[PDB]
Design a protein around this ligand. Sequence first.
Ligand code: NA
Ligand code: NA
Ligand code: NA
Ligand code: NA
Lengths: 150, 152
Amino acid sequence: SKVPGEIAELLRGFPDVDVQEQAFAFLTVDTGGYPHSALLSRTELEPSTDEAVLFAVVASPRTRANLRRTGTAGLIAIDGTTCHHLKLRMTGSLADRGLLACIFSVVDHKRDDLGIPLQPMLFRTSADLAEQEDWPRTRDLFERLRAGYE
Amino acid sequence: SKVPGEIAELLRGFPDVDVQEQAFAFLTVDTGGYPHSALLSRTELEPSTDEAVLFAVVASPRTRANLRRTGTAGLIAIDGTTCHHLKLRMTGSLADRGLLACIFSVVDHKRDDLGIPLQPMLFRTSADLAEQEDWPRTRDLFERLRAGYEQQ
Ligand code: NA
Ligand code: NA
Ligand code: NA
Ligand code: NA
């Protein structure tokens, strides 16, 4: 399987500052079988060059724990009139202190088009946000993961 | 553990046509252990009068199947600078053709505030949508669910 092309297009690349960006719901499953969520952005999600896998850099401690337990995840991505629902299986990972760089294979993709414009969850990037989230460190871990995968 | 008042305020009431509304991610878990999602709105979510429980009307067949198997769910709600994450346990249900009216107790509420404005997933209602989704049918099912809950 592969990362759907419409989704690779929404996730590829890394945001500039002072621009609205989509916040993507990144879903996991907790110890009690309840759905769990965290919001990620293009800074933390990146398709492989061959688009076969989706890379993620996850800081959230509870999300990391869930991935390490079940290896299952999901993603919600909005574009135009379509709500994309992805199901993901973690096939590999690399830990760096409080960060988990993950490789995911897509297990399912549902395109839910209600035929009406949908606005994604949105936030504005900033220099302070780039500083608080340590954007350069995330970018380095991505390079290490891509090298290992390639 | 009642419905948090902040969450009740975001879900209370039913939209008219031609208004911009939040689409809330309603989360379940599939048989393979993968998170599953459907988008709901204030048309399909409503707090009880005592704010003790959250009512929902769910059409999505796969979401309904997951609820029947686990009785567990989640909700994402965005407001201001906060992303609210709810975990939900189904304590009651009433089925009708293609529709599941559910009663949920909130078992956890997390507020993820990164301190920057966040806008919710948004869509505009319309007469076209109310026709496609059969809003009167959903409203009728809510009334029956509420009657049951209150007659308890
Ligand atoms: Na976040
Ligand atoms: Na990216
Ligand atoms: Na929907
Ligand atoms: Na409502």
